[PDB]
Nucleic acid binder design. Structure first.
Lengths: 109, 109
DNA sequence: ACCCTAATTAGGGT
DNA sequence: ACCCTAATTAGGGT
């Protein structure tokens, strides 16, 4: 078991910030400080942009999968037959709401 | 056993055309019809440009390995400590010289 | 003129 | 606003 609270704060915040209009790849690009065309410039102004460079894109993906399993995030069909987005669940919003005023743990396996 | 003469003609021709100035990557980019910056535009006017499109870069690389083992191609250290080029052997050049006027077989395994 | 890897992009469908 | 993959380009070791 390990407390992933600090990393969960970054990722769940990124999902919130980007408005749950994209899949999890965009929050990850955001945290990894990407210059990708997929990510709008307005977001590069946010203080969290590029603050997740310590971890690889692959790591952040693996992490997002666990957070889905644990019920903090969910993926759902949106827009059309091709697309899905990644969203905070109510549980994820509750955790984030608290995390926004003091550090929260999020322990995994 | 299979006769790879038609493919050998393309690859050994490509090595010669690029002047043995590179490793095997540039000959393959040439055969696969690449838009790469690495490949000068003058070569895109050659009749063999893009004629190896029906085999993957991976295949051509594997194929080049066999041709080295069978003594048609050699890798040669050149320029500086980082570099090697892929050249025709005397055998490879004799084979290509004949292949230029009538089809030659090149039987593998 | 090497090779490898990460980052990015275009384009089809999944 | 997705996926996976091919293609391309930059950096740097040795």
């Amino acid at each position: 078991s390990w407390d992933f609270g600090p990393q969960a704060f970054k990722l769940l915040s990124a999902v919130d910030i980007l408005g749950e209009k994209f899949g999890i790849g965009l929050p990850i690009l955001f945290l990894r400080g990407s210059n990708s065309q997929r990510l709008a410039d307005q977001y590069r102004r946010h203080s969290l942009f590029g603050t997740g460079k310590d971890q690889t894109e692959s790591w952040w993906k693996a992490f997002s999968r666990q957070l889905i399993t644990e019920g903090f995030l969910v993926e759902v069909s949106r827009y059309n037959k091709f697309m899905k987005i990644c969203a905070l669940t109510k549980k994820g919003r509750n955790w984030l709401h608290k995390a926004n005023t003091e550090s929260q743990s999020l322990i995994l396996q």
